[PDB]
Ligand binder design. Structure first.
Ligand SMILES: CCCCCCCCCCCCCCCCCC(=O)OC[C@H](COP(=O)([O-])OCC(O)COP(=O)([O-])OC[C@@H](COC(=O)CCCCCCCCCCCCCCCCC)OC(=O)CCCCCCCCCCCCCCCCC)OC(=O)CCCCCCCCCCCCCCCCC
Ligand SMILES: CCCCCCCCCCCCCCCCCC(=O)OC[C@H](COP(=O)([O-])OCC[N+](C)(C)C)OC(=O)CCCCCCCCCCCCCCCCC
Lengths: 253, 74
């Protein structure tokens, strides 16, 4: 899968000996979006409070000239909006999109003063607010969540499957794999355990030296690329600024 | 005669799990010693699991009858 994201930060991770833990739930389970490849029905649902968003929506609709949409959405959303839980876009991402796409400072400041910093917009809100399709908003939210896939997403819990057949096959595996002298062989004790243990000890002792010695070149390349990009962009910008005043010759003439 | 009847019942209910664990185990061990192929082994794993469940059932039955036989009013 492609590596999505607009960040130039070369980021690597170090692991611990502890597993990720989430609050107990009898119906949901947390998993990685790329490893699960979930669908809209696999996603878990919950109810969100409307008023704070419905006020801003009424304002925007009175400004744009479409109140039927507000009325329909409010009658749909009363008693809370039932929506997929981990399909959203953050306020910061939305503000960046608005700014780069040309929404005015007044509208951006309205967004900022209206919604908290940790607010999370979902695809129905986005669709009713920008006169778009919930399908497109869902796809956009999914892409923006995959851009930050370190955060687990909440799916519906499903019991395990095929446990009986798996038990049969695992019994067959042990019955055919442990009925031997492999784990007691001179080959084992002379090559498999010594070589493997030496590799493991060396890896545990030089775990970080190796990683750094490997990543040095990639870090240098990324730094070089970013520097070149910055210098070129700055030069072009300042030169166009110099030549910006070459249009008034006509209106002077 | 009631003492003999009672001791017979008690011993039977006490050894029931031992039987389920030992003699059926010997039968399973015969089958394991005789079988070589993979299909029969795949099918026999489920018999082993059923023996597990049957042992637990016999243990539950014995627990019930023993709490009945060792319950005193005073
Ligand atoms: C050339 C020489 C060699 C030739 C000889 C070859 C010999 C081959 C023998 C045949 C066996 C082949 C190997 C596969 C074995 C099955 C493995 C399996 O599926 O288990 C997983 C099965 C599925 O559970 P899961 O994987 O955990 O989760 C999935 C769900 O269950 C969801 O599962 P699902 O939705 O997919 O299906 C559910 C199904 C699961 O039940 C089963 O286990 C399936 C067993 C079907 C065996 C059919 C054998 C066909 C070949 C022999 C022909 C015999 C004539 C009969 C023809 C069929 C018509 C009746 O049924 C149920 O669970 C209960 C609902 C009942 C619904 C109706 C089911 C019948 C459908 C109609 C028949 C379809 C026929 C298809 C056409 C075949 C054409 C080739 O669970 C089991 O393990 C069942 C118990 C295991 C069976 C053995 C029980 C212990 C008895 C051991 C035997 C005694 C020891 C040996 C000594 C014998 C001395 C004589
Ligand atoms: C009023 C009083 C009523 C009393 C009722 C009494 C009826 C039930 C009595 C059954 C007792 C059976 C226990 C002895 C058999 C197991 C021996 C053993 O531990 O093997 C070594 C086991 C297995 O070892 P192993 O197989 O891994 O390798 C070594 C085995 N040896 C040493 C034998 C070669 O030791 C363990 O590590 C076990 C740890 C897991 C826990 C297993 C215990 C649960 C299974 C038995 C449950 C039986 C009680 C069920 C009660 C149900 C009541 C509702």
């Amino acid at each position: 899968y492609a590596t999505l994201g607009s960040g130039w930060s070369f980021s690597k991770v170090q692991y611990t000996k502890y597993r990720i833990t989430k609050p107990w739930t009898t119906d949901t389970t947390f998993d990685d979006i790329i490893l699960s490849q979930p669908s809209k029905e696999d996603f878990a649902k919950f109810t969100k409070e409307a008023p704070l968003f419905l006020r801003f929506l009424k304002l925007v609709t009175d400004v744009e000239g479409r109140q039927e949409a507000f009325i329909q959405f409010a009658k749909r959303c009363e008693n809370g909006l039932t929506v997929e839980k981990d399909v959203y876009v953050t306020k910061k991402e939305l503000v960046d999109c608005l700014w780069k796409n040309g929404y005015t400072d007044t509208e951006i400041n309205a967004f900022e003063i209206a919604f908290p910093a940790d607010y999370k917009f979902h695809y129905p809100e986005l669709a009713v607010l920008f006169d778009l399709t919930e399908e497109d908003c869902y796809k956009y939210c999914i892409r923006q969540r995959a851009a930050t896939p370190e955060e687990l997403v909440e799916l519906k819990y499903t019991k395990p499957k095929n446990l009986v057949s798996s038990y049969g096959l695992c019994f067959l595996g042990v019955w055919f794999g442990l009925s031997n002298t492999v784990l007691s062989n001179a080959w084992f004790y002379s090559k498999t355990f010594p070589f493997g243990a030496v590799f493991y000890m060396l890896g545990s002792y030089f775990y970080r030296d190796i990683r750094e010695k490997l990543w040095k070149e990639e870090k240098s390349l990324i730094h070089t690329a970013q520097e070149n990009k910055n210098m070129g962009e700055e030069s072009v910008y300042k030169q166009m600024k110099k030549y910006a005043t070459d249009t008034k010759c006509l209106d002077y003439l | 005669r009631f003492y003999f009847m009672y001791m017979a019942r008690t011993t039977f209910q006490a050894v029931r799990p031992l039987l389920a664990f030992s003699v059926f185990g010997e039968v399973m061990k015969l089958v394991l010693a005789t079988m070589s192929s993979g299909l029969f082994s795949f099918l026999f794993s489920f018999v082993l699991a059923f023996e597990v469940f049957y042992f637990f059932l016999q243990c539950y039955i014995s627990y019930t009858f023993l709490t009945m036989f060792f319950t005193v009013l005073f």
